[PDB]
Structure 1
Amino acid sequence: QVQLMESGPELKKPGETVKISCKASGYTFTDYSMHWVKQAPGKGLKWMGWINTGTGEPTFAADFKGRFAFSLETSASTAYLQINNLKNEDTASYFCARGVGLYGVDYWGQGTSVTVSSPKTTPPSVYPLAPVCGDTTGSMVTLGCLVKGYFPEPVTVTWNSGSLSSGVHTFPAVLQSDLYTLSSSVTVPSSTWPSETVTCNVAHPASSTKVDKKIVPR
């Protein structure tokens, strides 16, 4: 049972440094190289380099030279990746992967997300969104919940404490002024609302806030 386990997610500010660990189990650490790969959130996989396991020597791709470091602690079968002078475009997931020489890489670690930004922890404003005239088609009616200006992610948005899963669309957050916003819509038959209560719930564990906004007709 081969396994590559990486350290947890990290939030850093520009100019800081981060070090990411990758621990190998179930095989002889020194018999395989170790590679590192960067994925941007959009975006296709990009190789950063590799480290000789036996000699503890880094090789870097040209685009990853001088601000990145590979290191080892052989006795503990872990490899490290360290990024210096963190810049905004270092926001990404970073993977370690076991090298099989001319055949590339075979096992992958679960990945470590890295976020670089200057905002401070901020709780969201939560806005109920009640329908207007054309927001009914046929039997159904669509209601919304807008969650604006928080940091960091995640937020958990549910509807009536999760009992209303069936017709929900919750959208990924996008940045705005180095803060995040997401939206969520829920569609229900026009004969349950507003006769039956519909409430969106937002939890933001980084700021210890939990808020409910009932959607009330305009």
Structure 2
Amino acid sequence: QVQLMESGPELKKPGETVKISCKASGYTFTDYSMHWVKQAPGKGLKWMGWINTGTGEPTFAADFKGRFAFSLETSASTAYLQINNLKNEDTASYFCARGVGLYGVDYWGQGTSVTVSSPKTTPPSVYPLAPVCGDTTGSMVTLGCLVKGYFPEPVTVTWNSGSLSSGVHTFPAVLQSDLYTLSSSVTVPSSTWPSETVTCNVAHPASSTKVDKKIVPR
């Protein structure tokens, strides 16, 4: 099977240099243009360029010219995008793509997301978010977990060890001052809270911090 396999997602800092691998598999490396495509975290596919697999000769889009090094290891059939002078714009998911050429790119690297930024690994502030009079919706008391100020992602936010799946909506962690806050919300019936404990169990493998906060009535 032809499979484009790449390096792993990598946290980086501004000014650094990243080289994302792409290893060819299941096909003759030489014969197909190896391509690179930038998917910015919010943006769609923005094609970075292609390095000629026969010659090892890179070709860059006017954008990607000059900051980025396409390189091809031949024997082991690995392709590389090396980004130099890492920038917070260089934070993005990056894809090597095997050219079927004038038919474009058939397959794709499994994906490699660079995160270029300064911050240091930080534990979350996990806040049990209790409902008030209006926050009790029908029989259900919606409950919440404010997971606040951690770098990097992810945190693993479960609810009573994940025993609450359904009413849970764990909402996306986003950047705050290069730290992450997610406010996760379980919807539990007022019959089960605070009669049954609702404890949002928040594990942050990067900071190695597992923080468990029971939501208690205000």
> What TM-score, normalized by structure 1, do the two folds share?
0.98
Taking only aligned residues, the RMSD between alpha carbons, in angstroms, comes to 0.8
Measured against aligned partners, the alpha-carbon deviations of 1:111-170 in whole angstroms (never above 9, x if no partner) come to: 101001111111111111111110112211101000111011111000010111011101
Measured against aligned partners, the alpha-carbon deviations of 1:55-113 in whole angstroms (never above 9, x if no partner) come to: 00011000111100101110110001100111111110000111012111101111101
More helix by share: 1
Shift, 1:178, TM fit:
1.3
SS in structure 1 of the partner of residue 19 of structure 2: strand
CA–CA separation in structure 2 for the residues paired with 1:151 and 1:53: 38
Corresponding residue for 1:6? 6
CA–CA separation in structure 1 for the residues paired with 2:148 and 2:162: 21
SS in structure 2 of the partner of residue 37 of structure 1: strand
Higher mean displacement: 12-21 or 133-142 = 133-142
CA–CA separation in structure 2 for the residues paired with 1:30 and 1:45: 25
SS in structure 2 of the partner of residue 167 of structure 1: coil
CA–CA separation in structure 1 for the residues paired with 2:169 and 2:138: 19
Shift, 1:36, TM fit:
0.1
Shift, 1:18, TM fit:
0.4
Counting only pairs closer than 5 Å after superposition, residues 31-42 of structure 1 correspond to structure 2 as: 31-42=31-42
SS in structure 1 of the partner of residue 75 of structure 2: helix
SS in structure 2 of the partner of residue 149 of structure 1: strand
Indicate whether 1:182 and 2:182 are aligned: yes
Alignment gaps of 5+ in structure 2? none
CA–CA separation in structure 2 for the residues paired with 1:136 and 1:124: 27
Shift, 1:14, TM fit:
0.5
Alignment gaps of 5+ in structure 1? none
CA–CA separation in structure 1 for the residues paired with 2:196 and 2:46: 51
Measured against aligned partners, the alpha-carbon deviations of 1:190-217 in whole angstroms (never above 9, x if no partner) come to: 1111111110101011111111111111
**Misfit runs of 4+, over 3 Å:** none
